Design a protein around this ligand. Sequence first.
Ligand SMILES: C=CCSC[C@H]1Nc2cc(Cl)c(S(N)(=O)=O)cc2S(=O)(=O)N1
Ligand SMILES: C=CCSC[C@H]1Nc2cc(Cl)c(S(N)(=O)=O)cc2S(=O)(=O)N1
Ligand SMILES: N[C@@H](CCC(=O)O)C(=O)O
Ligand SMILES: N[C@@H](CCC(=O)O)C(=O)O
Ligand SMILES: [Zn+2]
Ligand SMILES: [Zn+2]
Ligand SMILES: [Zn+2]
Lengths: 258, 258
Amino acid sequence: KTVVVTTILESPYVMMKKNHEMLEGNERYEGYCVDLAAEIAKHCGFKYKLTIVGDGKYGARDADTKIWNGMVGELVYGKADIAIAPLTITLVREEVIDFSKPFMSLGISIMIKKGTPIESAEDLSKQTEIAYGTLDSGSTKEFFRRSKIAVFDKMWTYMRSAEPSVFVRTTAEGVARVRKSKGKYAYLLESTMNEYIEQRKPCDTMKVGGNLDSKGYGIATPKGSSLGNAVNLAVLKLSEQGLLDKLKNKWWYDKGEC
Amino acid sequence: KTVVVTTILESPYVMMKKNHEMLEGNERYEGYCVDLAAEIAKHCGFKYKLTIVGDGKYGARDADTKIWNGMVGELVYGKADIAIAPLTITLVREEVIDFSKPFMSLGISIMIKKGTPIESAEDLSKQTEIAYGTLDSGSTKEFFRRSKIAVFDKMWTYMRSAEPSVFVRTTAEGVARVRKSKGKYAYLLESTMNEYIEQRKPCDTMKVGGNLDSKGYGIATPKGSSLGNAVNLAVLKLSEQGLLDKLKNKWWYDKGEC
Ligand SMILES: C=CCSC[C@H]1Nc2cc(Cl)c(S(N)(=O)=O)cc2S(=O)(=O)N1
Ligand SMILES: C=CCSC[C@H]1Nc2cc(Cl)c(S(N)(=O)=O)cc2S(=O)(=O)N1
Ligand SMILES: N[C@@H](CCC(=O)O)C(=O)O
Ligand SMILES: N[C@@H](CCC(=O)O)C(=O)O
Ligand SMILES: [Zn+2]
Ligand SMILES: [Zn+2]
Ligand SMILES: [Zn+2]
């Protein structure tokens, strides 16, 4: 059977090619995760179809209804066979789906417009002039919501009650907000996305401070799926043969505009 | 039953306590992995005994005989229930044992005596005045042995044939060799150990260049062991609550001597 791959439009993991309308199937997309999928499938010996997650989300469990949305949801409810995306390995997710060893490392980080008077999370927490928020429905939000650390609980306390909302529906929305707010908004997002955007025109944002945590993205499959074994091994192999580092440079730094 | 934990004397993961000559059982030891074991066993609800691996090795397979030595062999042959140590996740190991998600990140790196005229692996490869080597029966050696990369292959070709041997039986041997070779020996070892030593008297070594690869340590169990599941989830939990970051700072930078 052809493996259904759920993924998500997020630069530079997966992007529409500048001419997709004249192309079909997997050929419409490009990016780090597009390249990885081809490699995973070749080594694991399967055919596959990339499909963009319907609700444009990563995956969260609705408190009350207990329904999972996003890519996680499509794996849990049987819509997809595998997720190849910047999907963060987390405990609540590991409880309902299987993750391979990480194919890329990241930490929550701070994006500012250049010249913004901010060096750290502690800095953000001690003031109110500069607003700050995170993506919706993602691991970054949950990090803050669940945190017992001082600086982080205070930040959550501010963020949850800020109005207008400091949360964004997409990474692009967050970046645009930083860019348009003249230094009055900072965005909390994963280091990988932060570093990509830092290398893109108009070159007006930067990552500041150390990361808030340390984790990674994993390739995910439905709990107990037979795919898991092969896919995990393929990730280790590709990692050892230098493919992942090659892809990272290809899509982040080789392209560099700044 | 009491879990038999296999581990290895390797600073600052597992070290004999000072007062040492007065304690019994697990109490004899201190370090990152010592603290990690306690936490894991707490959250998984088991009692355990720390045992120092008999042959003092991480684990590799004898080509010719195909028998695994080191901590890997102790799991494969049934002498131990779990390994908690700076044990690198690799493809050939994953094929015979199970690893949790990584609990710490590292990459292969270069340690020099301060002032040694070397800035990179390329630098090492381009010259002969300064000898260099790696640990025996570990993942770093295998890295070079199996490397297709131009720079590293040339380094391996030199290393496998050098005389006197440039390989060492333990990290401590490698480090003493850098320190007493007046800059004529560079040691290839994992960034984690390199950074620890760099902050310890006599403060005469340093890490130079960037990491050659990106990987991680995992807690290992015999393949298909039931313990594996609980252990993995315990690592995730510990990661998310910040204990892992707590432990790292305790054993690396809070110690700082330089
Ligand atoms: C869902 C998560 C899968 S990976 C979790 C992760 N945990 C950590 C924690 C720490 Cl403190 C470190 S570090 N900075 O001490 O090295 C590294 C990692 S990880 O990236 O190896 N995995
Ligand atoms: C623990 C078992 C297998 S881990 C293999 C590893 N691969 C890489 C590769 C890269 Cl290039 C990166 S990075 N530097 O681009 O973020 C990260 C990882 S990993 O640590 O997530 N896993
Ligand atoms: N990688 C995150 C989404 C981005 C973020 O939350 O910063 C996730 O899997 O939920
Ligand atoms: N961490 C390595 C040992 C140290 C090294 O090879 O540099 C292993 O698990 O084999
Ligand atoms: Zn003694
Ligand atoms: Zn605990
Ligand atoms: Zn032999």
